[PDB]
Amino acid sequence: KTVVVTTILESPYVMMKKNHEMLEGNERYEGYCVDLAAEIAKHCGFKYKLTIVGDGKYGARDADTKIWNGMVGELVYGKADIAIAPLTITLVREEVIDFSKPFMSLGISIMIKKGTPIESAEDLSKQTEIAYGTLDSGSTKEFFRRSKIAVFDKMWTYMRSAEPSVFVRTTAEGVARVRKSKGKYAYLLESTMNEYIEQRKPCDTMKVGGNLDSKGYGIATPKGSSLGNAVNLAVLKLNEQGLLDKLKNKWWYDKGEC
Amino acid sequence: ANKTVVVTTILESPYVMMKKNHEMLEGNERYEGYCVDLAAEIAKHCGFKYKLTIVGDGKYGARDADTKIWNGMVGELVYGKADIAIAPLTITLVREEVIDFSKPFMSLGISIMIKKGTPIESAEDLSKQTEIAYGTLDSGSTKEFFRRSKIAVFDKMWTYMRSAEPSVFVRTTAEGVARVRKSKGKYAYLLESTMNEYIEQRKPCDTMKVGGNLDSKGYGIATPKGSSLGNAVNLAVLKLNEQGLLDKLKNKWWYDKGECG
Numbered sequence: 029k030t031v032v033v034t035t036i037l038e039s040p041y042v043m044m045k046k047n048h049e050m051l052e053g054n055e056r057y058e059g060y061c062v063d064l065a066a067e068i069a070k071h072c073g074f075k076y077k078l079t080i081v082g083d084g085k086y087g088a089r090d091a092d093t094k095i096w097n098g099m100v101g102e103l104v105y106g107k108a109d110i111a112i113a114p115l116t117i118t119l120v121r122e123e124v125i126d127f128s129k130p131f132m133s134l135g136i137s138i139m140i141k142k143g144t145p146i147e148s149a150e151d152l153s154k155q156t157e158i159a160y161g162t163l164d165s166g167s168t169k170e171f172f173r174r175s176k177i178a179v180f181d182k183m184w185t186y187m188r189s190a191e192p193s194v195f196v197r198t199t200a201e202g203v204a205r206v207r208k209s210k211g212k213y214a215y216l217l218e219s220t221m222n223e224y225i226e227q228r229k230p231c232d233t234m235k236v237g238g239n240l241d242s243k244g245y246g247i248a249t250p251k252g253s254s255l256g257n258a259v260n261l262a263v264l265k266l267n268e269q270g271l272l273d274k275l276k277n278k279w280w281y282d283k284g285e286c
Numbered sequence: 287a288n289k290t291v292v293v294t295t296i297l298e299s300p301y302v303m304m305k306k307n308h309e310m311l312e313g314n315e316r317y318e319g320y321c322v323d324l325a326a327e328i329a330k331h332c333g334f335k336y337k338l339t340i341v342g343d344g345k346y347g348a349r350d351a352d353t354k355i356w357n358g359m360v361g362e363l364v365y366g367k368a369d370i371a372i373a374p375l376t377i378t379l380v381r382e383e384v385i386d387f388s389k390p391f392m393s394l395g396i397s398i399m400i401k402k403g404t405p406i407e408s409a410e411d412l413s414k415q416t417e418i419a420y421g422t423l424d425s426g427s428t429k430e431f432f433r434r435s436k437i438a439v440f441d442k443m444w445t446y447m448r449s450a451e452p453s454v455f456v457r458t459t460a461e462g463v464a465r466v467r468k469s470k471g472k473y474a475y476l477l478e479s480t481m482n483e484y485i486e487q488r489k490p491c492d493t494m495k496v497g498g499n500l501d502s503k504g505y506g507i508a509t510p511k512g513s514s515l516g517n518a519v520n521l522a523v524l525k526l527n528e529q530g531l532l533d534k535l536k537n538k539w540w541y542d543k544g545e546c547g
């Protein structure tokens with residue numbers, strides 16, 4: 029019985045191959061999660077089909093309707109058997125689905141265009157000449173909305189009140205905005221993506237400062253899933269054998285363009 | 287029928303330490319540290335009463351190959367002697383096979399400790415020379431990491447360490463640190479990054495953590511398989527992290543109390 033894998037088009041985790049049109053099935057896709065899915069299925073002994081999440085979302089529960097969207101939605105409503113993607117392990121998600129132990133550790137970080145005289149969160153919060161912001165929705169924004177730490181609360185108030193808006197619709201828009209803003213915009217995003225973009229042409233961005241927090245991506249399965257236990261052991265084994273580090277290197281650095 | 291939760295832990299600075307005045311104290315209050323504070327939080331969120339007990343054999347948890355017996359805190363859980371372990375206990379495959387772990391409350395990796403001034407910047411640097419000796423604890427997970435590693439650099443280091451004379455291994459973490467401090471830049475110590483960072487903030491302020499971490503892993507709260515507490519404990523850990531409490535706790539024990547500026 030073929031396992032339905034839900035995932036999301038997010039570089040360099042899952043991308044359509046340049047020559048995808050001459051390809052079929054799983055082979056249409058490449059990336060860190062594509063490689064990880066193969067390793068997991070190999071170790072747990074299952075065949076699987078990669079499917080792209082229908083609504084292009086990760087997974088948030090609507091406050092009013094209480095409906096779950098994205099890949100979490102596909103798990104809880106029975107459309108997919110497992111999610112393999114840069115999906116953060118969080119309390120609200122863990123209440124309705126299971127996560128493996130983390131396959132990648134990350135935190136919120138700062139992206140600047142090279143030349144921008146900013147070196148940390150503190151620096152940013154102490155000035156306004158260089159605008160800075162986050163995705164207009166989701167986890168990073170929420171970190172600042174809910175934060176009780178002085179400097180981060182400060183940054184948050186600055187962001188809500190800054191004009192024009194410092195928020196962006198998509199991660200790509202955030203990156204593009206840093207790139208086209210001639211050193212006058214800084215983007216706060218997950219460190220994994222920051223580190224990746226830093227190795228891509230035109231090589232005009234960099235990561236500065238330490239991560240503002242600490243979290244991890246996990247493989248997700250429905251509660252009670254007969255795959256959950258084996259998938260978790262697979263992630264730990266892959267980590268312990270150095271495979272996860274090797275996959276990170278392959279996709280961030282070896283295939284790097286800088 | 288409800289019973290007090292038996293917590294197994296271990297004396298390891300700054301996770302769990304006996305208070306200077308422990309003699310005039312009783313029970314849990316004899317102890318202080320990061321893991322003491324964390325246990326308080328977990329129990330508070332999960333709503334259980336608990337008793338801190340120190341692991342009888344002073345070990346974290348490994349299965350003897352010959353006897354097949356699990357020692358340490360893992361063993362306590364596996365053999366039914368404790369309800370939960372709260373300590374710098376790494377989540378690993380062989381342990382997950384026999385107990386449950388929460389998601390990590392702390393992230394870490396194997397790292398290099400040097401005496402300040404030592405001309406070494408990475409594992410790669412160490413492996414390519416022998417003038418500056420380097421080693422690990424004479425047992426446990428860091429040594430086992432190098433023994434099992436099929437990564438070229440780490441295997442080469444293992445081969446060097448196993449054959450180096452005099453012995454580059456040490457009996458305790460304290461010994462390794464002391465050896466770094468006394469060896470005039472001629473000994474480098476491989477240990478978990480958490481402890482490395484801690485020691486870096488302690489007088490005489492003569493050590494330094496250098497290079498990237500050699501691996502990536504996490505410490506987790508452990509319960510016996512099928513335990514009733516496992517689920518609630520896991521959600522508690524996630525909440526504490528998201529609420530910023532785990533970072534604040536690490537700051538308290540590592541940096542606020544820091545002795546090196």
Ligand SMILES: N[C@@H](Cc1cc(Cl)c([N+](=O)[O-])cc1CCC(=O)O)C(=O)O
Pocket residue numbers: 038086087114115116117162163165166167168169199216217218219220221222
């Ligand atoms: N891990 C997030 C999804 C996500 C993934 C990536 Cl890889 C990036 N990113 O490219 O910086 C962002 C996000 C959303 C937060 C953000 O704005 O960083 C989740 O589980 O909700």
Ligand SMILES: N[C@@H](Cc1cc(Cl)c([N+](=O)[O-])cc1CCC(=O)O)C(=O)O
Pocket residue numbers: 298346347374375376377422423425426427428429459476477478479480481482
């Ligand atoms: N997390 C390890 C135990 C441990 C804890 C600490 Cl706090 C340090 N350390 O202070 O460097 C080391 C170890 C492992 C021995 C060693 O590497 O010396 C486990 O679960 O086996």
